[PDB]
Amino acid sequence: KPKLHYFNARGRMESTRWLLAAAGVEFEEKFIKSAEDLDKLRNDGYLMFQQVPMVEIDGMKLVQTRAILNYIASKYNLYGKDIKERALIDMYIEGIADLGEMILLLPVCPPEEKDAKLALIKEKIKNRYFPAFEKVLKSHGQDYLVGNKLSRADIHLVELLYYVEELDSSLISSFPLLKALKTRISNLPTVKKFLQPGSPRKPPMDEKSLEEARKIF
Amino acid sequence: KPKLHYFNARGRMESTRWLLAAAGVEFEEKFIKSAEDLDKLRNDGYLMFQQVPMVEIDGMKLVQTRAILNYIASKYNLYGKDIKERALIDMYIEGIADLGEMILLLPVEKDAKLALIKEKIKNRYFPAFEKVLKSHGQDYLVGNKLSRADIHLVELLYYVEELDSSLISSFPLLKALKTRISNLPTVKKFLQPGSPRKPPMDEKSLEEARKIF
Ligand SMILES: N[C@@H](CCC(=O)N[C@@H](CSCCN(CCCl)c1ccc(CCCC(=O)O)cc1)C(=O)NCC(=O)O)C(=O)O
Ligand SMILES: N[C@@H](CCC(=O)N[C@@H](CSCCN(CCCl)c1ccc(CCCC(=O)O)cc1)C(=O)NCC(=O)O)C(=O)O
């Protein structure tokens, strides 16, 4: 079973957790608890650029978030049916990662500029990203973003919808098709199980855990 | 010809220019010069996220650097022969992308950062790739066949040279890869004068990237 090496938090590993679970793939997690736990992965030659996330899958040690996701998405037929579909998927998920990244780094952001950063994110969500995705759905009227078949684009998008909801549950209000997508995807057997309590889904970064991050890393 | 929409500068479109030319594909560039030119692309509905780079290729309008490079890489078989090779390729180029993003944003805490980038190149990135080349002793990074990994790395080797030519001294293999790749007919052509390759961003286009954006 795929072994995911990361600390006990969402961070850069959460999208992978969401994708595997959505693919109905059982995985393992080897939690880094200290800076010393990390140094060993390094000295043990497990980390190409001395960083995590690192995932042990099918005989090799993959680092770099996108390498991990691209591999899993292709293996479990969640990367579309051809080069053109992947292009759409890629364009969609890179837009999702751009927003996800901003949200992911808000708590690491220096205090004095946290307010401006959060306002900037909410503006982009309402005027740039949510409309872009709502439009995709309204254009073709299908249940999924691409090829009228479940793909990583739908998984990454809905995962983000949950983070936007925690940030401000009003942002998605004027985007019915998105709201509807979140519901459909959330009720797919695998995703519904991942969303249930006790699953490996991680909580939003709190405090004790951010302090542990700057400590380990 | 694929149509590249960006402003006359390297920025986020340079890696694409290198890839297309490496694949021997001729392209056209529609240079954005003003803030209005950028607004016209938006109003015409050509930018999914209101951003560039954006490339028109095979009938689609693709934005997002990685979406563009990924498509081009696969189309011209520069993305490995299978899923496992693509993973190695992706792992390699993403490390490259990380080091590039650092340099790409440097001009936009100056000293402290520069000294950090150099240390990472010397102690983290170059050793990682040097190690790769030594592990199999082949002319290319993956599957002993040219791939986007060779092109992006070599492109980066050039940028690192412009920054400090001494940084690649303790890495003989990276040095060698750079010479073989630069000698490939297509890459050599892109390296000679008059090619679409863009110059380092000086004071100007930095203010033009400021004005246009
Ligand atoms: N492009 C790479 C980046 C990999 C990377 O940055 N790895 C970090 C760890 S990523 C997890 C830690 N981190 C980044 C700073 Cl360390 C981080 C963790 C959690 C958050 C979340 C903050 C709260 C929130 O999510 O809102 C943000 C950053 C690492 O190993 N650093 C050590 C080193 O470089 O020497 C990839 O995507 O794999
Ligand atoms: N994830 C996307 C991001 C695309 C993106 O950032 N596009 C920018 C333009 S990227 C080119 C400009 N730029 C980034 C700030 Cl705008 C930039 C340009 C040149 C340099 C290089 C400086 C010199 C050096 O390389 O050292 C750095 C940044 C854009 O169109 N913004 C408009 C908006 O958001 O409303 C992608 O990778 O395609």
Author numbering:
A (entry chain A): 4 to 220
B (entry chain B): 4 to 111, 116 to 220
Excerpt from the publication:
Structural studies have shown that GSTs are dimeric enzymes with each subunit containing a GSH-binding site (G-site) and a second adjacent hydrophobic binding site for the electrophilic substrate (H-site).
The hGSTA1-1 enzyme was crystallized in the presence of CBL and the X-ray crystal structure was determined by molecular replacement at 2.1 Å resolution. Difference Fourier electron density maps indicate the presence of a GSH moiety in the G-site of the enzyme. Electron density is observed indicating the presence of a chemical moiety in the H-site that is attached to the thiol group of GSH that is bound to both monomers. These may be consequences of the high mobility of the CBL moiety due to its extensive exposure to the solvent and lack of specific interactions. Several van der Waals and hydrophobic contacts exist between the CBL moiety and several residues including Gly14, Leu107, Leu108, Val111, Met208 and Phe220.
